[PDB]
Design an enzyme around this catalytic site. Structure first.
Site, PDB file in Angstrom:
ATOM      1  CE  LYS A  17      -4.451   0.602  -0.707  1.00 38.91           C
ATOM      2  NZ  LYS A  17      -5.161   1.582  -1.089  1.00 38.91           N
ATOM      3  CE  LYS A  36       8.396  -3.709   2.556  1.00 45.11           C
ATOM      4  NZ  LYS A  36       8.684  -5.255   3.187  1.00 45.11           N
ATOM      5  CE1 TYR A  86      13.999 -12.558  -5.550  1.00 44.47           C
ATOM      6  CE2 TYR A  86      16.112 -13.793  -6.223  1.00 44.47           C
ATOM      7  CZ  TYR A  86      14.770 -13.587  -6.296  1.00 44.47           C
ATOM      8  OH  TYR A  86      13.757 -14.325  -7.488  1.00 44.47           O
ATOM      9  CB  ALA A  87      13.856 -14.662   0.042  1.00 47.04           C
ATOM     10  CG  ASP A 130       2.605  -9.283  11.557  1.00 43.86           C
ATOM     11  OD1 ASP A 130       2.475  -9.405  10.234  1.00 43.86           O
ATOM     12  OD2 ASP A 130       1.500  -9.444  12.385  1.00 43.86           O
TER      13      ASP A 130
HETATM   14  N1  LIG Z   1       7.888 -10.163   3.060  1.00 47.63           N
HETATM   15  C1  LIG Z   1       7.608 -10.164   1.998  1.00 47.63           C
HETATM   16  C2  LIG Z   1       7.256 -10.117   0.694  1.00 47.63           C
HETATM   17  C3  LIG Z   1       6.052 -10.607   0.137  1.00 47.63           C
HETATM   18  C4  LIG Z   1       5.480 -10.475  -1.161  1.00 47.63           C
HETATM   19  C5  LIG Z   1       6.528 -10.367  -2.172  1.00 47.63           C
HETATM   20  C6  LIG Z   1       7.621  -9.518  -1.860  1.00 47.63           C
HETATM   21  C7  LIG Z   1       7.901  -9.810  -0.206  1.00 47.63           C
HETATM   22  N2  LIG Z   1       9.544  -9.234   0.019  1.00 47.63           N
HETATM   23  C8  LIG Z   1      10.576  -9.802  -0.376  1.00 47.63           C
HETATM   24  C9  LIG Z   1      11.969  -9.426  -0.254  1.00 47.63           C
HETATM   25  C10 LIG Z   1      13.097  -9.986  -0.532  1.00 47.63           C
HETATM   26  N3  LIG Z   1      12.825 -11.107  -1.377  1.00 47.63           N
HETATM   27  C11 LIG Z   1      11.587 -11.733  -1.732  1.00 47.63           C
HETATM   28  N4  LIG Z   1      11.811 -12.776  -2.421  1.00 47.63           N
HETATM   29  C12 LIG Z   1      10.626 -13.232  -3.156  1.00 47.63           C
HETATM   30  C13 LIG Z   1      10.855 -13.916  -4.216  1.00 47.63           C
HETATM   31  C14 LIG Z   1       9.635 -14.625  -5.146  1.00 47.63           C
HETATM   32  C15 LIG Z   1       8.538 -13.897  -5.061  1.00 47.63           C
HETATM   33  C16 LIG Z   1       7.487 -14.304  -5.877  1.00 47.63           C
HETATM   34  O1  LIG Z   1       7.557 -15.427  -6.793  1.00 47.63           O
HETATM   35  O2  LIG Z   1       6.283 -13.779  -5.876  1.00 47.63           O
HETATM   36  C17 LIG Z   1       8.125 -12.970  -3.928  1.00 47.63           C
HETATM   37  C18 LIG Z   1       9.159 -12.464  -3.205  1.00 47.63           C
HETATM   38  N5  LIG Z   1      10.659 -11.054  -1.403  1.00 47.63           N
END
Ligand SMILES: N#Cc1ccccc1Nc1ccnc(Nc2ccc(C(=O)O)cc2)n1
Length: 263
Positions: A17, A36, A86-87, A130
Protein backbone atom coordinates in the site's frame (compact mmCIF):
# COMPACT_ATOMS: atom_id res chain seq x y z
CA UNK A 1 26.02 6.09 0.12
CA UNK A 2 23.71 4.51 -2.50
CA UNK A 3 21.14 5.87 -4.98
CA UNK A 4 18.56 4.39 -7.37
CA UNK A 5 21.35 4.73 -9.96
CA UNK A 6 23.35 1.79 -8.71
CA UNK A 7 20.48 -0.63 -9.39
CA UNK A 8 18.92 -2.36 -12.32
CA UNK A 9 15.24 -3.12 -11.77
CA UNK A 10 13.34 -6.31 -12.61
CA UNK A 11 9.76 -7.31 -11.85
CA UNK A 12 8.03 -6.06 -8.75
CA UNK A 13 8.17 -9.10 -6.45
CA UNK A 14 5.14 -7.85 -4.54
CA UNK A 15 3.08 -4.66 -4.28
CA UNK A 16 2.19 -3.01 -0.96
CA UNK A 17 0.00 0.00 0.00
CA UNK A 18 2.91 2.34 0.72
CA UNK A 19 5.02 0.84 -2.09
CA UNK A 20 6.59 -2.23 -3.75
CA UNK A 21 9.56 -4.57 -3.68
CA UNK A 22 11.25 -5.01 -7.02
CA UNK A 23 13.84 -7.53 -7.99
CA UNK A 24 17.15 -5.64 -8.34
CA UNK A 25 20.94 -5.81 -8.63
CA UNK A 26 23.82 -3.50 -7.88
CA UNK A 27 25.18 -2.48 -11.28
CA UNK A 28 28.85 -3.43 -10.76
CA UNK A 29 28.72 -6.71 -8.81
CA UNK A 30 25.51 -7.66 -10.65
CA UNK A 31 24.78 -9.19 -7.25
CA UNK A 32 21.06 -9.53 -6.76
CA UNK A 33 18.93 -7.88 -4.08
CA UNK A 34 15.40 -6.71 -3.41
CA UNK A 35 14.42 -3.07 -3.45
CA UNK A 36 11.57 -2.04 -1.19
CA UNK A 37 10.15 1.30 -2.22
CA UNK A 38 8.10 3.67 -0.05
CA UNK A 39 6.17 6.76 -1.34
CA UNK A 40 6.74 8.79 1.85
CA UNK A 41 3.75 10.89 0.90
CA UNK A 42 1.73 7.80 1.57
CA UNK A 43 4.05 7.39 4.52
CA UNK A 44 3.85 10.36 6.87
CA UNK A 45 0.08 10.61 6.33
CA UNK A 46 0.05 7.38 8.40
CA UNK A 47 2.31 9.20 10.87
CA UNK A 48 5.28 6.97 10.19
CA UNK A 49 8.61 8.61 9.47
CA UNK A 50 10.58 9.03 12.71
CA UNK A 51 9.60 5.56 13.96
CA UNK A 52 10.46 4.07 10.59
CA UNK A 53 13.80 5.86 10.80
CA UNK A 54 14.74 3.87 13.91
CA UNK A 55 12.90 0.65 12.98
CA UNK A 56 15.25 0.43 10.03
CA UNK A 57 18.15 0.68 12.49
CA UNK A 58 17.00 -2.44 14.25
CA UNK A 59 16.59 -4.60 11.15
CA UNK A 60 19.90 -3.11 9.93
CA UNK A 61 21.96 -4.39 12.85
CA UNK A 62 20.12 -7.71 13.19
CA UNK A 63 21.97 -10.67 11.61
CA UNK A 64 20.74 -14.25 11.32
CA UNK A 65 20.17 -17.09 8.77
CA UNK A 66 16.41 -17.11 9.37
CA UNK A 67 16.01 -13.33 9.25
CA UNK A 68 15.87 -11.39 5.98
CA UNK A 69 18.76 -8.92 6.21
CA UNK A 70 18.59 -5.23 5.30
CA UNK A 71 21.85 -4.36 3.58
CA UNK A 72 21.40 -0.58 3.43
CA UNK A 73 18.94 2.27 2.89
CA UNK A 74 18.53 5.61 1.13
CA UNK A 75 15.85 8.13 0.23
CA UNK A 76 15.64 10.54 -2.68
CA UNK A 77 12.92 13.19 -2.54
CA UNK A 78 9.68 11.39 -3.12
CA UNK A 79 10.69 7.77 -2.21
CA UNK A 80 12.41 5.78 0.57
CA UNK A 81 14.43 2.76 -0.41
CA UNK A 82 15.31 -0.35 1.56
CA UNK A 83 18.06 -2.48 0.08
CA UNK A 84 17.07 -5.99 0.99
CA UNK A 85 18.40 -9.50 0.82
CA UNK A 86 16.67 -11.38 -1.98
CA UNK A 87 14.74 -14.53 -1.12
CA UNK A 88 14.44 -16.64 -4.30
CA UNK A 89 11.67 -18.97 -3.22
CA UNK A 90 9.35 -16.19 -2.09
CA UNK A 91 6.60 -16.63 0.48
CA UNK A 92 5.59 -19.58 2.60
CA UNK A 93 2.07 -18.32 1.95
CA UNK A 94 2.16 -19.26 -1.71
CA UNK A 95 3.83 -22.56 -0.89
CA UNK A 96 0.97 -23.22 1.54
CA UNK A 97 -1.45 -22.37 -1.26
CA UNK A 98 0.26 -24.91 -3.49
CA UNK A 99 0.70 -27.87 -1.11
CA UNK A 100 -2.62 -27.14 0.65
CA UNK A 101 -1.07 -28.25 3.99
CA UNK A 102 2.41 -29.04 5.17
CA UNK A 103 3.80 -32.15 6.76
CA UNK A 104 5.37 -32.61 10.15
CA UNK A 105 9.06 -32.50 9.24
CA UNK A 106 8.49 -29.27 7.28
CA UNK A 107 6.45 -27.61 9.99
CA UNK A 108 8.73 -28.74 12.81
CA UNK A 109 11.81 -27.40 11.03
CA UNK A 110 10.21 -24.14 9.93
CA UNK A 111 9.05 -23.85 13.56
CA UNK A 112 12.56 -24.51 14.78
CA UNK A 113 13.79 -21.89 12.34
CA UNK A 114 11.25 -19.35 13.48
CA UNK A 115 12.03 -19.96 17.14
CA UNK A 116 15.78 -19.55 16.59
CA UNK A 117 15.16 -16.15 15.02
CA UNK A 118 12.81 -14.76 17.70
CA UNK A 119 15.18 -16.07 20.38
CA UNK A 120 17.98 -14.12 18.75
CA UNK A 121 15.71 -11.06 18.36
CA UNK A 122 14.59 -11.30 21.96
CA UNK A 123 18.23 -11.14 22.98
CA UNK A 124 18.47 -7.93 20.95
CA UNK A 125 15.40 -6.60 22.76
CA UNK A 126 13.09 -7.10 19.77
CA UNK A 127 9.51 -8.46 19.89
CA UNK A 128 6.04 -8.00 18.40
CA UNK A 129 7.42 -9.47 15.20
CA UNK A 130 4.58 -9.97 12.82
CA UNK A 131 5.10 -13.34 11.21
CA UNK A 132 2.15 -14.66 9.26
CA UNK A 133 2.78 -16.77 6.13
CA UNK A 134 2.88 -13.80 3.72
CA UNK A 135 5.67 -12.20 5.77
CA UNK A 136 7.79 -15.28 5.65
CA UNK A 137 10.13 -15.90 2.78
CA UNK A 138 12.08 -18.91 1.52
CA UNK A 139 15.78 -18.36 1.10
CA UNK A 140 18.49 -20.02 -1.00
CA UNK A 141 17.75 -23.73 -0.72
CA UNK A 142 15.16 -24.42 1.97
CA UNK A 143 15.29 -21.79 4.69
CA UNK A 144 12.90 -19.52 6.40
CA UNK A 145 13.34 -15.80 6.60
CA UNK A 146 11.45 -13.31 8.73
CA UNK A 147 10.74 -10.38 6.49
CA UNK A 148 8.48 -8.41 8.82
CA UNK A 149 9.63 -4.82 9.03
CA UNK A 150 8.37 -3.05 5.88
CA UNK A 151 4.61 -2.67 5.62
CA UNK A 152 3.47 -5.99 4.23
CA UNK A 153 3.63 -6.51 0.47
CA UNK A 154 1.67 -8.90 -1.81
CA UNK A 155 2.34 -10.85 -5.06
CA UNK A 156 -0.88 -11.50 -6.98
CA UNK A 157 -2.67 -14.68 -5.79
CA UNK A 158 -5.93 -15.72 -4.04
CA UNK A 159 -8.50 -12.90 -3.74
CA UNK A 160 -10.32 -14.63 -0.92
CA UNK A 161 -8.67 -13.24 2.14
CA UNK A 162 -7.46 -9.74 1.24
CA UNK A 163 -7.61 -8.25 4.67
CA UNK A 164 -9.60 -10.40 7.06
CA UNK A 165 -6.35 -12.37 7.36
CA UNK A 166 -5.29 -9.86 10.06
CA UNK A 167 -6.83 -10.99 13.27
CA UNK A 168 -6.02 -14.64 13.15
CA UNK A 169 -2.38 -14.09 14.17
CA UNK A 170 -3.14 -11.58 16.94
CA UNK A 171 -3.06 -12.83 20.56
CA UNK A 172 -5.96 -11.95 22.90
CA UNK A 173 -3.83 -9.32 24.73
CA UNK A 174 -3.18 -7.38 21.52
CA UNK A 175 -6.71 -7.47 20.11
CA UNK A 176 -8.11 -6.71 23.62
CA UNK A 177 -6.19 -3.48 23.60
CA UNK A 178 -3.95 -4.35 26.48
CA UNK A 179 -0.19 -4.23 26.56
CA UNK A 180 2.13 -6.98 25.37
CA UNK A 181 5.58 -8.49 25.83
CA UNK A 182 7.99 -11.10 24.46
CA UNK A 183 5.15 -13.55 24.95
CA UNK A 184 3.03 -12.36 21.95
CA UNK A 185 5.36 -14.20 19.58
CA UNK A 186 4.75 -17.49 21.30
CA UNK A 187 1.02 -17.18 20.55
CA UNK A 188 1.84 -16.44 16.92
CA UNK A 189 4.08 -19.48 16.78
CA UNK A 190 1.26 -21.61 18.02
CA UNK A 191 -0.90 -20.16 15.29
CA UNK A 192 1.64 -20.65 12.52
CA UNK A 193 2.10 -24.25 13.54
CA UNK A 194 -1.57 -25.01 13.49
CA UNK A 195 -1.96 -23.38 10.09
CA UNK A 196 1.03 -25.20 8.68
CA UNK A 197 -0.58 -28.52 9.59
CA UNK A 198 -4.15 -27.57 8.94
CA UNK A 199 -3.98 -25.28 5.90
CA UNK A 200 -6.22 -22.91 7.81
CA UNK A 201 -5.53 -20.87 10.95
CA UNK A 202 -7.11 -21.99 14.32
CA UNK A 203 -9.47 -19.02 14.59
CA UNK A 204 -10.66 -18.58 10.97
CA UNK A 205 -14.31 -17.37 10.68
CA UNK A 206 -16.74 -15.36 8.51
CA UNK A 207 -16.82 -12.21 10.61
CA UNK A 208 -14.19 -10.37 12.60
CA UNK A 209 -16.54 -10.57 15.57
CA UNK A 210 -16.69 -14.34 15.55
CA UNK A 211 -13.00 -14.47 14.78
CA UNK A 212 -12.45 -12.20 17.80
CA UNK A 213 -14.68 -14.39 19.97
CA UNK A 214 -12.80 -17.61 19.18
CA UNK A 215 -9.44 -15.87 19.66
CA UNK A 216 -10.08 -14.33 23.09
CA UNK A 217 -12.06 -17.36 24.28
CA UNK A 218 -9.34 -19.68 22.92
CA UNK A 219 -11.89 -21.88 21.26
CA UNK A 220 -10.07 -23.97 18.65
CA UNK A 221 -10.20 -27.61 17.59
CA UNK A 222 -7.97 -29.98 15.63
CA UNK A 223 -9.23 -32.11 12.73
CA UNK A 224 -8.59 -35.85 12.71
CA UNK A 225 -5.03 -36.12 11.51
CA UNK A 226 -3.08 -34.03 14.02
CA UNK A 227 -0.76 -35.93 16.28
CA UNK A 228 -0.90 -35.67 20.06
CA UNK A 229 2.58 -34.15 20.30
CA UNK A 230 1.54 -31.63 17.66
CA UNK A 231 -1.55 -30.84 19.77
CA UNK A 232 0.58 -30.71 22.87
CA UNK A 233 2.82 -28.09 21.32
CA UNK A 234 0.23 -25.67 19.92
CA UNK A 235 -1.86 -26.21 23.02
CA UNK A 236 1.00 -25.27 25.28
CA UNK A 237 1.50 -22.33 22.85
CA UNK A 238 -1.98 -20.85 22.69
CA UNK A 239 -2.85 -20.05 26.25
CA UNK A 240 -4.88 -17.00 27.10
CA UNK A 241 -2.46 -16.25 29.95
CA UNK A 242 0.77 -15.00 28.36
CA UNK A 243 2.73 -16.27 31.42
CA UNK A 244 1.48 -19.85 30.81
CA UNK A 245 3.22 -19.75 27.44
CA UNK A 246 6.81 -21.04 27.15
CA UNK A 247 9.99 -19.26 26.38
CA UNK A 248 11.44 -20.50 23.13
CA UNK A 249 13.72 -22.91 24.95
CA UNK A 250 10.99 -25.42 25.75
CA UNK A 251 9.65 -24.88 22.25
CA UNK A 252 12.95 -26.01 20.75
CA UNK A 253 13.07 -28.74 23.45
CA UNK A 254 9.58 -30.06 22.74
CA UNK A 255 9.37 -33.84 22.18
CA UNK A 256 7.49 -33.53 18.87
CA UNK A 257 9.71 -30.92 17.25
CA UNK A 258 12.91 -32.85 17.97
CA UNK A 259 11.14 -35.97 16.60
CA UNK A 260 10.14 -34.50 13.16
CA UNK A 261 12.64 -31.64 12.82
CA UNK A 262 15.38 -31.72 10.19
CA UNK A 263 17.18 -28.92 12.08
N1 LIG B 1 7.80 -10.08 3.14
C1 LIG B 1 7.55 -10.10 2.09
C2 LIG B 1 7.17 -10.14 0.62
C3 LIG B 1 5.91 -10.62 0.28
C4 LIG B 1 5.54 -10.66 -1.06
C5 LIG B 1 6.44 -10.22 -2.04
C6 LIG B 1 7.69 -9.73 -1.69
C7 LIG B 1 8.06 -9.69 -0.35
N2 LIG B 1 9.36 -9.19 0.01
C8 LIG B 1 10.63 -9.86 -0.49
C9 LIG B 1 11.90 -9.34 -0.19
C10 LIG B 1 13.05 -9.96 -0.65
N3 LIG B 1 12.93 -11.08 -1.40
C11 LIG B 1 11.71 -11.56 -1.68
N4 LIG B 1 11.64 -12.76 -2.46
C12 LIG B 1 10.52 -13.11 -3.30
C13 LIG B 1 10.73 -14.05 -4.30
C14 LIG B 1 9.70 -14.45 -5.16
C15 LIG B 1 8.45 -13.91 -4.99
C16 LIG B 1 7.38 -14.35 -5.92
O1 LIG B 1 7.68 -15.30 -6.76
O2 LIG B 1 6.24 -13.83 -5.93
C17 LIG B 1 8.22 -12.96 -3.98
C18 LIG B 1 9.25 -12.56 -3.13
N5 LIG B 1 10.59 -10.98 -1.24
Amino acid sequence: QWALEDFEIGRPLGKGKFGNVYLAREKQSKFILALKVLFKAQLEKAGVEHQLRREVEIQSHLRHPNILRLYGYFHDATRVYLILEYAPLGTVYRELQKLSKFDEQRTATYITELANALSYCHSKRVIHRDIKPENLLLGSAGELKIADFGWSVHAPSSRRDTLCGTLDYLPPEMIEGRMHDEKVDLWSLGVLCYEFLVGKPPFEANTYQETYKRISRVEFTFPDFVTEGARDLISRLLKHNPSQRPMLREVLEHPWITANSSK
